[PDB]
Every structure is written in structure tokens, then in C-alpha cells.
């Protein structure tokens, strides 16, 4: 892969991870939040 390709792959992989974490945070219910983040 060229440098332009490698940068495109890295940008896409990073944004996909951010989107997945954002989606999980937005949609997790209080019961799921209770299991992952206990107090």
C-alpha cells in the first residue's frame, strides 16, 4: 500500500472505532451500563 492508501485505511479504521464507541455509549441501557460501569 502507498502512503495515501495507508492513510486512507487508518482514517477509516479510526473513524469506524469512534462511531462504534459513540453508538454503544448512546444506546446502552441503564441495566447494561450497570454491568459495565459498577459503583
Amino acid at each position: 500500500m502507498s502512503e495515501a492508501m495507508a492513510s486512507a485505511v487508518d482514517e477509516a479504521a479510526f473513524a469506524d472505532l469512534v462511531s462504534k464507541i459513540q453508538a454503544a455509549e448512546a444506546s446502552m441501557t441503564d441495566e447494561q451500563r450497570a454491568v459495565i460501569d459498577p459503583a
Binding site: 479504521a13 469512534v18 464507541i21 455509549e25 454491568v35 459495565i36
Partner: protein, 310 residues
């Protein structure tokens, strides 16, 4: 900097990591580029969490849930800072005692992790090599080829420790739960430090976990020059591990530790040479690691049996 947005991005050859600011703190996520059975699945992560839960290691273990086969989400932590931010700091800033104490706490944490009986972790695989190399056998062979092309005279002490020296230790010793990727970039610093990652965990040599942690001290000493600070961190790590375990490391344990550490340095420099087509830069890194390693192993408490090999 706003809630719901990424505050840190840590790309890597084998894993991408992001820290999202959220309402309740800071949420780490990780992705790997291939779905591979080498990475712990949901059941293995649950089995390991269940085994850690009744122990003194529980407080530190921030074990993720899986969104999908490639993607992990961690329990929230209170800061986006990482121990690596201190270890690789350039230029120097003020020593924060509570951050430095993280090394003693990590050594104690690891001693506790390494005491979990194997019968409580039936889902964990034996780690015959790091999870990331087992997931990508072509990368492993390429790194091995680049490592073979390293100048054998650049770091003769590191070569001895990784090769002939490592083989002198007995092969029969207790294998333990290992975290598998305990770099300083996977540690949230104290007070109340937390350990991230976990999908590379399994059953292997406990000395490999300590070696992986010490590698960051060697690399930073070589690259940034704070040799004395890195040596003190190494000494604190050993102090915490030995105090928690109640027994000092044996000569055999030190031989295995030094072998994993020296091999890890060679893997690191070989990766730079092969990932970035930089044989000459990797050579420079290796020669500096050769100069930094003796003091770090000495501070950790390694005997002349190990440090005699240079």
C-alpha cells in the same frame, strides 16, 4: 473536548485505540483489524473477569465488553491519561509521586494476577506467542525475517539474553494467567490505577508480563534519555511484585524475564525496520537499547548471572 467526542487516538500496527469523553468519565475502545480466534472472545473475557473478581486484582482490572468480534469497549475511567504519557515525557516535567507509585502498584497487581489458579480460568488459551502475532502469522514471519537481518554486532548482550541465555532456564515452571499486553500505554496512572486491554490475556510465563512492562522503560530511556527515572520505575515494579508475592525472583525467573525483555526489544526494532522500511534507524534504536538495558535490569534486581551476559 466535548462529551461524546474522542480525546485520544492511539493507532498501532496491531490494535487501534480511542478514548471517548462521556458524561460519566472517559471510555476506552479498541479495535483489531481482523477477527481472529487468538483474541479473547466474550466468554473468555467473562471467565477471566469472574476469576479476578474475588481477588485483590479486581480493583485494577478494567476488562472490556465486546461490541463485535473486532471491537471492545471498556468500563469508564476517571482520566484520559496513561502511564506512558509520563514514561515517554519529553521534555521533563515535575515528578508526580502518585504517578510514580503506579509502578509499585502494578507490580503488586501482577503478582496477584499471576496467583489466580489455572483451574479458575478454563477458557483461557495457552499463549505460545503474542495474540497479535498468532492472529497475523505473515507479520510474525516478516518480523522474524527482519530480526534475522539485524546486525548481530549492534547489541551482542541483547542477543545473548534473547538466545543462548534464555534457553538455559528450565522449561518446567508454573504457567500463570498473563495480561499479555502490559505496556505502560495500557495503564491508567494512580491513584487508583487501572489496567486496560485484556484481549491478549491467556496462560503463559508470568515473567513475560513483567518484561513487556519493562520494555517501555528501556525504549524510553534510550529514546528520551531519562535513564535514572526509568531505572527507579523498574526498581519500584520489582519491589511491588516481590512484596506482594512474598518471595524474591529466582535466578531462573530473572533469566526468563531478561530473555523476554531482550526478545521484545529485538521484535520492536525489527518491526520498525520492516514496518517502515528503515533498517538503519532500527539499528540506531538497537544500539541505544543495548546501552540502556543493563541499568534497567540491574535496578530490577537481576543477578550477575543475567547481567554478566551484558
Amino acid at each position: 473536548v466535548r462529551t461524546g467526542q474522542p480525546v485520544r487516538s492511539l493507532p498501532g500496527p496491531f490494535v487501534n485505540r480511542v478514548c471517548l469523553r462521556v458524561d460519566s468519565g472517559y471510555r476506552w475502545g479498541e479495535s483489531v483489524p481482523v477477527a481472529a480466534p487468538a483474541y479473547l472472545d466474550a466468554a473468555a473475557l467473562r471467565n477471566l473477569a469472574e476469576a479476578i473478581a474475588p481477588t485483590q486484582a479486581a480493583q485494577y482490572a478494567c476488562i472490556p465488553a465486546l461490541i463485535d468480534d473486532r471491537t471492545a469497549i471498556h468500563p469508564v475511567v476517571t482520566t484520559p491519561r496513561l502511564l506512558s504519557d509520563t514514561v515517554f515525557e519529553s521534555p521533563a516535567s515535575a515528578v508526580v509521586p502518585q504517578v510514580e507509585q503506579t509502578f509499585s502498584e502494578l507490580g503488586g497487581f501482577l503478582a496477584r494476577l499471576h496467583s489466580i489458579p489455572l483451574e479458575r480460568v478454563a477458557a483461557l488459551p495457552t499463549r505460545t506467542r503474542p495474540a497479535w502475532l498468532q492472529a497475523a502469522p505473515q507479520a510474525a514471519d516478516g518480523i522474524r525475517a527482519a530480526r534475522d537481518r539485524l546486525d548481530k554486532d549492534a547489541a551482542p548482550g541483547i542477543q545473548r539474553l534473547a538466545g543462548a541465555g534464555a534457553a538455559e532456564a528450565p522449561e518446567v515452571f508454573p504457567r500463570t494467567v498473563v495480561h499479555g499486553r502490559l505496556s505502560t500505554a495500557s495503564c491508567v496512572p494512580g491513584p487508583a490505577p487501572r489496567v486496560l486491554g485484556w484481549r491478549e490475556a491467556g496462560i503463559a510465563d508470568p515473567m513475560a508480563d513483567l518484561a513487556f512492562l519493562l520494555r517501555d522503560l528501556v525504549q524510553s530511556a534510550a529514546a528520551m534519555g531519562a535513564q535514572q527515572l526509568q531505572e527507579q520505575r523498574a526498581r519500584l515494579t520489582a519491589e511491588g511484585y516481590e512484596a506482594a508475592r512474598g518471595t524474591q525472583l529466582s535466578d531462573d525467573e530473572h533469566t526468563r524475564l531478561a530473555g523476554h525483555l531482550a526478545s521484545g526489544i529485538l521484535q520492536h526494532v525489527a518491526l520498525r525496520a520492516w514496518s517502515a522500511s528503515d533498517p538503519e534507524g532500527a539499528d540506531a534504536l538497537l544500539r541505544r537499547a543495548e546501552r540502556s538495558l543493563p541499568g534497567i535490569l540491574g535496578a530490577f534486581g537481576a543477578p550477575r548471572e543475567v547481567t554478566g551476559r551484558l
